Amino acid sequence: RECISIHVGQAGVQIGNACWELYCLEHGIQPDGQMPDSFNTFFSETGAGKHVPRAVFVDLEPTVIDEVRTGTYRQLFHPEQLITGKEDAANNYARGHYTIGKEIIDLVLDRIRKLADQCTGLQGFLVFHSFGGGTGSGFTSLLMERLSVDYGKKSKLEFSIYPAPQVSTAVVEPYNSILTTHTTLEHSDCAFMVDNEAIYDICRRNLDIERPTYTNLNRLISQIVSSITASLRFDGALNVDLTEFQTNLVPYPRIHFPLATYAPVISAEQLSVAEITNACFEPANQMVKCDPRHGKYMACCLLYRGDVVPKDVNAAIATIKTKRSIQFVDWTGFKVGINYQPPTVVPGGDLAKVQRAVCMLSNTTAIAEAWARLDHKFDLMYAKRAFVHWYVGEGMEEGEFSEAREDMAALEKDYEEVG
Amino acid sequence: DLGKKLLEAARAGQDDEVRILMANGADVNATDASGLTPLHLAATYGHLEIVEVLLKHGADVNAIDIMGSTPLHLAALIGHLEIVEVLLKHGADVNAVDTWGDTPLHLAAIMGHLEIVEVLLKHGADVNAQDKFGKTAFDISIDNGNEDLAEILQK
Amino acid sequence: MREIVHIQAGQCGNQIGAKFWEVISDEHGIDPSGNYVGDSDLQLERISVYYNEAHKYVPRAILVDLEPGTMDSVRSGAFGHLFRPDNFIFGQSGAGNNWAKGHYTEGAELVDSVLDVVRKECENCDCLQGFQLTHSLGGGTGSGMGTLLISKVREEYPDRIMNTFSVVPSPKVSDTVVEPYNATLSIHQLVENTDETYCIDNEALYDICFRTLKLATPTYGDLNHLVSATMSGVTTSLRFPGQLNADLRKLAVNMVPFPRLHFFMPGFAPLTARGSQQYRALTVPELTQQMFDAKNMMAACDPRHGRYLTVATVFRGRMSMKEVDEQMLAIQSKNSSYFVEWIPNNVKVAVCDIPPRGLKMSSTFIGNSTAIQELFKRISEQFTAMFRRKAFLHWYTGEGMDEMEFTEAESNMNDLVSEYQQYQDATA
């Protein structure tokens, strides 16, 4: 039944804020957890009547989580599941994984166990974190290593924020990104990357926001997160368990990074099933910048929500296989899920309410282009050993850079061999 | 030995001891271990009156130490303008070259002693004189961005 | 990462230090009696970074000089009685520009009393970030005792960040010929023992006041007006909430690709003369282009003679984040040749809404540029001219130093120069 969500570092926490705000609205839960059962997968029940997120928030500095402790949702979460140290990772993977992360890892695991003990049938973890921060990269890797030992049979899914220069505040983010991808890869069953540049560009072009904040980005992200996790929270027929994500999206265990494409995104200022389904193959709606026409599809799911008749999905799917050139690897279907509840948007938000929406999850080799971009920026800096001393002085050996990079080159080769 | 005493008295600025020592026969052109004379030392340490006294009693204004330094090199380096003027008046070689190829102009230029640079120029310092690395004083002023010095070196 | 401990040593260190505390006390609404009198709560959110709270905010500042009279002149300044009285540590005379007296004899006699006070301040800190030292490199106390203090603090607190504002000597401002010795001996210590050093060059400050500001006879007051406007701008990110370079360690990880190349070039726009009426605030294009202009640099080096390894830029005032982004993207576009291609995305931009006093628009540049080698070469050339003739060496070696420390200091500084040159010529 149960899933535990874990939010790590600034990006993971602030996106978590936006996801649980939306979840609460989707399920009729007030910010104090009261509600005048499907979502029990994500919420425990007190029986004062209080529905509490099965969620943990962790940061090595207190400032972002202090805002959760004193905001609108100050009463929603278990307060012992809001966990903070005092000195952050300083944009340094090594400090998040070794020298600073080590001071709080045991507390975090003991607090996760407390959640896990209230579960009769825990499925696993959803882990939210940036690639670019020291805590999002390094403490996440550490936590995923411990979770693999302490919960060996449980699934682990990630929602991972891929860095963009528009909102970057550290030159070393390509290092942290490759270091954490290397050390998390064997411990993660399926990971959904969110390119901040793709979300930024959607906000500017579809929502007419001149300078997107986090908040703008995070509300859009959380609509996409919600469409992905809705099957877990509304007893669907597709992706009913965490294990099914791997089955349906990851036919190859290292290549476990599906592309999300979401439509329609409409400014607060109606499209048919065929129209929103066609919009799933337009690059401007992708959550990661890359070109699926230059790659091969290995698996595809279409997750509809709202006023969606199954026959109209079947017809629209027929049209696009008979018009577009959607090349599937030879070792070729669409899996379909329909949630009949209308999409919810936040009161505050930049998004119009729509009558029907869809999220396509496609495992395409074209996402290798996103890796190639990170790898190339890694290579430029590493060749001069720029900034490497910051890592070697914080509990890490220099050979871990080249091990991480060779692992990325293998991953790029994995993509080339499937097509 | 009166020579070692006179060298130390010239360096320390002991005008009375300089006088008593010379009256007892001290060698006005004595040298220390490195070839420095009482005039080199008075010029280095700024003792103008001792500079004048030594020059009036037989000191060689152009003596060189083991490194080719003259008194004028050292006065120009440390930046003692009055002493530079008195040395030139007594026939100091404005273009003497030391073992690094430096002239007094190079050293005043490097140390930013702009008023000494101008005095040296007016007494015929060689703007084309190159050090062992091929730099003239003008090269030094261009290479190090000293625009006030560069303008003076072309007046 | 909360508290910073400030130490100011010697005349220059204490004068620019006093000015810093005046300037940030006004930005934070702290009056000379320590009460808060401000109108914005952005002012108090990070007040603990620089102030202890008794209700009454006291600078976390330690005041040191071998020269006793410095205590008096600080105390007679506007904020002089707000400094904690037991944090004044003073000797009996003054080093006479002798680095060796500062580092080895009289300054070593005084340093343990300084460390006692340091120790005591560090104990009251919730989460000590590290240290900020203001000093000059050309004197005897701020240079020789200051660098002894740095090494002793480093060994006792090796996990905290050590930051300096180091004032580099110029013959245009002070015609003492032993200052290149003192600077070179100190630079050797700063290479090994600080994490970040802002190079405040008296040569550049003099040139700005003389040539750009048309000031006939620049005073230390004129130079220090530029210093304090630089010190306020480069600490803005430490003193207010924000995303970029928000503490000393994140600043370092952004700004220092190689541990020894930690000497930054401070630029500032607009450059003002004191008691001038800065009318017609600058545009965003004007702040951007003026910030990278050699004539706005607090280090006497032409940035276009070298290449930028990393840069941070802070804009202060009400302006469009969109037009800042555009102007900053543009100046990198046109000048891409001057930004090393092997450190992608190496210019970070912050925009903070509270402008400094007197201005509605201002910006601050913090560059790690290989052109800083021109400043080191200038000091090295002067050091070498003096040291070849062994001028005044006995004055130093008679206080315990060996001539070989001169040689070692010279060679380390020339090694530093070659390293800048190496990354200047490096290709992706």
Ligand SMILES: Nc1nc2c(ncn2[C@@H]2O[C@H](COP(=O)(O)OP(=O)(O)OP(=O)(O)O)[C@@H](O)[C@H]2O)c(=O)[nH]1
């Ligand atoms: N989409 C989104 N991205 C964020 C947010 N906060 C930070 N980022 C991105 O996250 C990356 C670095 O920020 P945070 O990384 O998460 O850092 P951290 O995990 O707290 O680690 P340290 O602060 O280094 O300890 C950059 O790429 C930012 O653009 C957010 O709220 N939303």
Ligand SMILES: Nc1nc2c(ncn2[C@@H]2O[C@H](COP(=O)(O)OP(=O)(O)OP(=O)(O)O)[C@@H](O)[C@H]2O)c(=O)[nH]1
């Ligand atoms: N920019 C600036 N430079 C100063 C100031 N005061 C002194 N200096 C410079 O500092 C150098 C001399 O160092 P001082 O601070 O005066 O000497 P000290 O550290 O007090 O050491 P001693 O007096 O030798 O014991 C020279 O380069 C001066 O030009 C000042 O207020 N502002």
Ligand SMILES: [Mg+2]
């Ligand atoms: Mg953080």
Ligand SMILES: [Mg+2]
């Ligand atoms: Mg003094």
